[PDB]
Amino acid sequence: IKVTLVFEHVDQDLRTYLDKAPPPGLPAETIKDLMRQFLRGLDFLHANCIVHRDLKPENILVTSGGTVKLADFGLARIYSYQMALTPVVVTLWYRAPEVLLQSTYATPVDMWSVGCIFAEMFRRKPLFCGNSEADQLGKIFDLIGLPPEDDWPRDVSLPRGAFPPRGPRPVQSVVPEMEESGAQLLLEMLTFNPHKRISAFRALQHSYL
Amino acid sequence: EEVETFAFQAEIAQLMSLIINTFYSNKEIFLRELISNASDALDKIRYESLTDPSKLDSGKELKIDIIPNPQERTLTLVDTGIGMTKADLINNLGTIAKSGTKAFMEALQAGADISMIGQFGVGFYSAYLVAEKVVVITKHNDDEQYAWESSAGGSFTVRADHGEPIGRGTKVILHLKEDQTEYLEERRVKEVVKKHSQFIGYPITLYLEKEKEKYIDQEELNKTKPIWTRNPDDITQEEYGEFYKSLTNDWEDHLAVKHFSVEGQLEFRALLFIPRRAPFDLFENKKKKNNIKLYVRRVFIMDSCDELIPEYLNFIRGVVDSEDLPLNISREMLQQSKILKVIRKNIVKKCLELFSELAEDKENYKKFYEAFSKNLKLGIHEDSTNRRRLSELLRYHTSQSGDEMTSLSEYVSRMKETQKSIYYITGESKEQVANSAFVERVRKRGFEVVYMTEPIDEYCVQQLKEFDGKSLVSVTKEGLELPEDEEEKKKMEESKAKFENLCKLMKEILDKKVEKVTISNRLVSSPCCIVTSTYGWTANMERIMKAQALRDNSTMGYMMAKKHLEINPDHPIVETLRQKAEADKNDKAVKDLVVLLFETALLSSGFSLEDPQTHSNRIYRMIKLGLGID
Amino acid sequence: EEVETFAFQAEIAQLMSLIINTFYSNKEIFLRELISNASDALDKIRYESLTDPSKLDSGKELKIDIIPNPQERTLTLVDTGIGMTKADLINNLGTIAKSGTKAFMEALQAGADISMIGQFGVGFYSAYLVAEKVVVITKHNDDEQYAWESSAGGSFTVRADHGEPIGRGTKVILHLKEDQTEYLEERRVKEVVKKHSQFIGYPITLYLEKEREKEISKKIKEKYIDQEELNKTKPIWTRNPDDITQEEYGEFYKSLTNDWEDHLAVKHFSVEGQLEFRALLFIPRRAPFDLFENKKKKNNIKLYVRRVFIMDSCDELIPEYLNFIRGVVDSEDLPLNISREMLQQSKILKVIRKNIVKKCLELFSELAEDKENYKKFYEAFSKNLKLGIHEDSTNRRRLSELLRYHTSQSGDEMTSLSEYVSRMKETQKSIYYITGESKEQVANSAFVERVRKRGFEVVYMTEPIDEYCVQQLKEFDGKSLVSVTKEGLELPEDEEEKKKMEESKAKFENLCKLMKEILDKKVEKVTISNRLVSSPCCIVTSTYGWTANMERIMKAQALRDNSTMGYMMAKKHLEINPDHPIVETLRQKAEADKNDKAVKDLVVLLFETALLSSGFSLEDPQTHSNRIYRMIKLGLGI
Amino acid sequence: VDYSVWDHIEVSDDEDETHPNIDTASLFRWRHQARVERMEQFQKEKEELDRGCRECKRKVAECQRKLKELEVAEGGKAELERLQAEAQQLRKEERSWEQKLEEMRKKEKSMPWNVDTLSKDGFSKSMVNTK
Ligand SMILES: Nc1ncnc2c1ncn2[C@@H]1O[C@H](COP(=O)(O)OP(=O)(O)OP(=O)(O)O)[C@@H](O)[C@H]1O
């Protein structure tokens, strides 16, 4: 008799995790781990110039050991089989402003996406929810704050300047059990201007995590 | 002035000791190195004789002779090469990091069909890993016969030889160390020969003191001949078979064979063989992965198939012989392992092509598949990039088939014009699933299903999410969609109401045993059945995973799918129960019956039974009631 | 003829290219070798200053600094070591196979506590793997400052003091190749030195452009990073075990591997023999999720030589079943090859392994005293223990004492087999056990009914791996282990009751025969056994082959469809409980009419339910349930 | 004595360059895609640079023909001088396209090796031992 091994693949989609997860106030410490699991993965992905602005909650795998695994790196190599008919039209509360502005992929883009996801994790519910890209920003701005056409990116398809200025809403108080340091990291990730955001490495190495 | 210039120096006194202590790991390779050099010299002759045939007057035979001498504890190697001149001995042999093979090859830039090895110029000194002292005697056509003697003590001596004459070439005398006498053993010698010199172009002989104990010329020492070096279009099947048998030692020949060669920065030739039978230790965890070997200029380098090929293809036997690789100072190791990965990729492509053409040969494909389908399925599990190609090779039993398997594409060609998915069922046996209640309605709808009876199919089907644009669906899971006649649908809704409170009652009875109780037309001859939620393990998956010795039990918290009780409204039992609920929903005997039905269904649906003893105890009680015992 | 004497020669022009091009495969050794040399020079000072304090008049601080310069694409290694003279640059640095470490090897007769790293006199030239040009500036106290310079073009030069204050050690200037710019990256540097300079006695720092807030102070952050942290973890095994406490020792563990919790248990191991070495063995408090992911290359036990990382081949260093122990093995007496990537004479490691295993077992024995933490240990790695027992037959003598099981007398408390033995009845000459799917299954099995009635204790086993363990462990403390699921369960009992059983056998003799005929090709032999109490019968396994549980495991887990073995191993019999009311009735029914099909069908029913209770899957579960449904319909008047 | 020719081999399925938080089942495929896109863009660049070079080459060639004609023309030497300057600009443009093409050659030299550049399918021959 000989010995041989075979192993099962994990299909525990983040979305499923969140469906199995408890009500608003998801253990911040658990999330801190999951955050740094995600961000560590990003550092690898940034080192390898991995482009995937299309990464959404459902492209995040949460394993039985609490490990965040990332998959599906952009439309270029995903959905080669049956897919959603509204992959973009669907509420893009998990897509960076830069996606909504029709620009490109970047470290801040990626982190903006997951930033909302991190808040979703705490709430067990989507951080933002708009209709069009401009409307989606109209919901985003309510948390992060908004300025006139003097703090907007060059490559913008949306009517920049036609977005009535407003203040932020302390992420700490908005998102359940969001410890101030995490609120700062998140707010930085959520900040509209991509150059006012925090890199995956910086956030990963932050004492909060 | 402000700067002084010096040439680099080298303390040979220590350099030499590095060469014979730190440069090499294995020591038996000393034969490899000596033989290698011998074959180079034989090639030198060959080339030279092309321009001047009279150079062969002093010997027309090209070979290598190995003659052990236990009486002296030495080993004599006779190389019938060109030989070296006095100058060559003191300029080449006695010089570290320099070889006349390279220089000869530089002369050969004029054009030649010569394949020589030896770009380092140090291998000779490896002789001192084993031998205490080495003596080299040689006779060049343009010079006298000389003896070269050294114990690697920083110096060497040369004197014209006397006595036995050398026509040409050179002899190497290995004054073997006292603790290295194991290399005087026939077996040990042959071991090394087979290890590194099976494909040396020239005949190598081994002389043994045997019947009359005289040196017997073992001419067959390396009788194995290279095949990939020959023109593929001129090679017969009989020849491929002979090679295969020689390579693998399998008395039965191969199923299929394929040539493969590439040109450019990477250049090599290769033979891959598909065996007719799988080996009994095919999946042994600790089995040395040496099915395909790597050679450079027909010299064995390594056989690390762990990197060279995919594990799911680790049954194909073969030889890869490259022309020019970046080998380490120790030829046992290759630098830039990414090269091997490149080679791998090319191998895989051709193996898959072979499989495709093998599939064209149905009669032999089925033989192949029978023996190695597990590997193909493994590939589906392991390889995310060639999965699609591999899926074309899959074959299963289906409802309209007999004992003949069929592809998914063939299934697709038989799909109904309104069929959007591939129906299948997994289990322990063909008969088991053939008699499953889950496929009865499906058969009533005129649909065909795919039968999956190997435990590994659970891993395979996990990855087979879509095939040729068609989705896949298990009849064992909730949400099975079969043709819905609007008239029927109305009747089903009426039935749902009819048995609504009944289902509620059953749920109250089995609140902690079943997640949901409902009716379903997926059933025909069964009163009920347990199904599995689309999320989590199936009955089959669960059973299999709970048989895994090294499984982490806590993973069940993410995999324990919910159970639902399907009810079939058309049974007298179900109708009776409805009527009994109406008569008295609190009737104990009825409740007991409900529980019985559940456990019966649960068990027969392929799920783990919580307590076989209790279940059977109830049965025994019923038996006793039938017997009138008590 | 006349014997001419010659000295060996060397073609340096080619040799040099061999050194660079063929001796190394991993260019990460670039920094390793450079750093190693720096540490040797620092040791040279340590000794000289130890014996003569005035040696530090031109500098006391000993360290290794790395300064990258992206704007030039160059690297600077600052060695505060003893330095070299002009003659040394010419003699030592400019000569292949030449090293001054051997000068100290011989010179340091008094310096027995000094240990230099390596001795080939070649590694220096490995700088050219990634560097286009190397410049070495140095000033030994007994000479002036000189600048050695070469691009490995067959020659080298030496220049006079250029004014850049270097009064000690040397500045190694590395002009990097166009395509080697990755080594100018912080990350990459750290990756390399982390794996090679981890345990350098002297502190290694980096001087990096500090990532900072724009200098608009309004805000501003520091301009440069001093990465001393590279050597925050010091050697522990080098100190005296008796003087080592957890307050520091535990910090080593969490630094050894990224685990923010103290270890479960450890064992310091000192070897003062030929293979002198010291080792720290660690047991994690929790098993890793990838513990059995054997596709992954091992790296738990790492091999260091003179505190320098060499190998991590656990495949040789330890046995597979101990592949959870993490640790460090450090020897200064090993014969590494020219690349220093592989130890020569693997037989050395074989010896080392055996010594390690011995102490691992000793640690486990030590843990056995701490019941609380032992429990924790056992539970976390019980599979590994069991794997060892299966594979490592040599050490079963020790591994089998580490086993712990739940029994019929201990209940919820898990106990030792030795404790079982110490409490065995004077007639209890064997260990009784049962394997199955779960605790409550076997705890309510018909197999253990009589056993409990006889006052015997039953060892409960539940894992697939337990099913493997019993295939290897045959005896313990001189007594054999007996499965209660096999035929011929000779429990200690009153001979008169055995006589009653023989009388019962006569009584139900015809019944058994009939049942056998009924169950022809279903069961190998129908008989009677008093191991049963509440059940009318039981399917049992033979004395050999696979058990119901073993088949459950092998048929599902094995990737090899060994139908030949399945065939050979598929054995089973039927035992009858002569006291059961149904059985009594069946006898009476057979006597009334052995051809009564209804009775025959009842027997079949009983058989199939017997298979169920014994863990044997039915060949057609659907037909079983069909019969049940028929009986239901009967009761319902359908 | 020099194996530097193999110091830059890019393998998209290199399983030794992975990460615990990344699913390589799709990562490897991402790499493949990226490589393809890089080859595409590279090729387009080269083709466009070559096109521009050839266009300016032809333009200056036609101007050179015309320069000869203007030289011959009775008083066309005034226009000749104007055209000469324009022709020089066209030649300089051609040159700069060529310089860019020289940079493309440098890019080719710097290009990582892969299965599409290391070799070609020199030979393939299957055979099934049927009978
Ligand atoms: N059978 C032979 N006949 C003639 N010359 C020989 C023979 N064997 C060895 N030599 C000589 O020995 C010299 C030393 O070369 P050596 O074999 O040590 O380098 P190499 O083996 O060619 O290189 P490598 O170290 O890569 O094998 C060569 O110059 C070669 O001429």
Ligand SMILES: Nc1ncnc2c1ncn2[C@@H]1O[C@H](COP(=O)(O)OP(=O)(O)OP(=O)(O)O)[C@@H](O)[C@H]1O
């Ligand atoms: N930073 C340095 N400071 C002082 N001497 C050095 C330095 N780097 C190189 N050397 C010289 O090089 C000699 C040996 O270095 P090298 O590394 O080449 O051989 P080794 O270190 O003895 O062993 P290996 O060759 O395996 O490294 C030293 O004895 C010394 O003379």
Ligand SMILES: [Mg+2]
């Ligand atoms: Mg040679």
Ligand SMILES: [Mg+2]
């Ligand atoms: Mg050194």
